[PDB]
């Protein structure tokens, strides 16, 4: 349904700074964060596609300042099985 935006940072500080920069510089909603272990944590925002594109392009710039960005990606329309199976905050 809603488009998906993610920031993955090796480190909790860069992830929190990235999540704050995403929710400030656009009208998105931080649904949560995933801890895949090894110091990698992933902040997940979700909203309409131009807003999450602006949010992640702000969060990538604000997380390279203080941390180490592993991956940035915007899924403009995730399939319903992704939201049903993986935890993206829109679980039916």
């Amino acid at each position: 349904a809603d488009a998906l935006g993610m920031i993955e940072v090796r480190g909790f500080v860069g992830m929190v700074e990235a999540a704050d920069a995403m929710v400030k510089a656009a009208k998105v909603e931080l649904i949560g964060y995933e801890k895949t272990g090894g110091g990698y944590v992933t902040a997940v925002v979700r909203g309409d596609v131009a807003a999450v594109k602006a949010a992640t392009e702000a969060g990538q710039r604000a997380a390279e300042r203080v941390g180490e960005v592993v991956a940035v990606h915007v899924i403009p329309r995730p399939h319903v099985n992704v939201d049903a199976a993986l935890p993206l905050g829109r679980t039916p």
């Binding site: 400030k24 510089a25 656009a26 009208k27 309409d48 596609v49 131009a50 807003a51 594109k53 602006a54």
Partner: protein, 198 residues
């Protein structure tokens, strides 16, 4: 004049973005305006000739529509584009300080400190005001945009002293060169709280 409100009514599309175009000429101000409204369906807030002979365009819309209108605008004004701005999400307190210059009549009974900042362009004033509203719990009191003072634009924030110092840091980062002067009053006098410009 209800097009400058922060949140729209329930039968309206939500338009959170804002783009400011400051132009040294008034004629291609109009050319930039209708080219931007030709390419993408933006809601144009103002097209106003302001002082020192310049033209101030402000448009409003969704993020993709404002981005497309602004890219059409900055490919037409090439040139006479003095300064530009493209915000995907303007802060809620900024929306009533656009149309007419607002002046404050009184502060609250807990207001500690106040920061007044002027920029050489309107776009730097709006950009620094939005950046300071986002990373500080400060309140925007009054703001003048190029009318009566020949192109320059100022605004004041109030709040707790450490908050307005953090806002001073972020304003001095976002302006950089367009900052003319910023003044960090830490405790204004009892004879001046709420009543600065008069």
């Amino acid at each position: 004049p209800e097009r400058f409100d922060a949140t729209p009514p329930a039968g309206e599309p939500d338009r959170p973005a804002l783009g400011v175009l400051e132009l040294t000429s008034i004629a291609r101000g109009i050319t930039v305006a209708d080219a931007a409204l030709k390419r993408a369906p933006s809601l144009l807030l103002m097209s106003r000739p302001v002082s020192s002979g310049k033209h101030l365009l402000m448009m409003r819309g969704q993020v993709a529509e404002v981005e497309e209108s602004m890219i059409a605008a900055r490919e037409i004004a090439g040139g006479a584009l003095l300064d530009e701005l493209e915000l995907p999400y303007a802060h809620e307190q900024l929306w009533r300080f656009l149309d007419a210059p607002v002046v404050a009549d009184a502060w609250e009974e807990d207001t500690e400190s106040v920061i007044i900042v002027e920029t050489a362009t309107v776009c730097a004033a709006i950009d620094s005001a939005d950046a300071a509203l986002k990373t500080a719990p400060v309140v925007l009191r009054d703001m003048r945009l190029a009318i009566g003072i020949a192109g320059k634009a100022f605004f004041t924030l109030t709040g707790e002293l450490a908050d307005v110092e953090a806002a001073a840091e972020v304003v001095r980062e976002r302006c950089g060169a367009r900052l003319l002067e910023l003044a960090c009053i830490a405790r204004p006098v009892d004879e001046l709280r709420g009543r600065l410009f008069f």
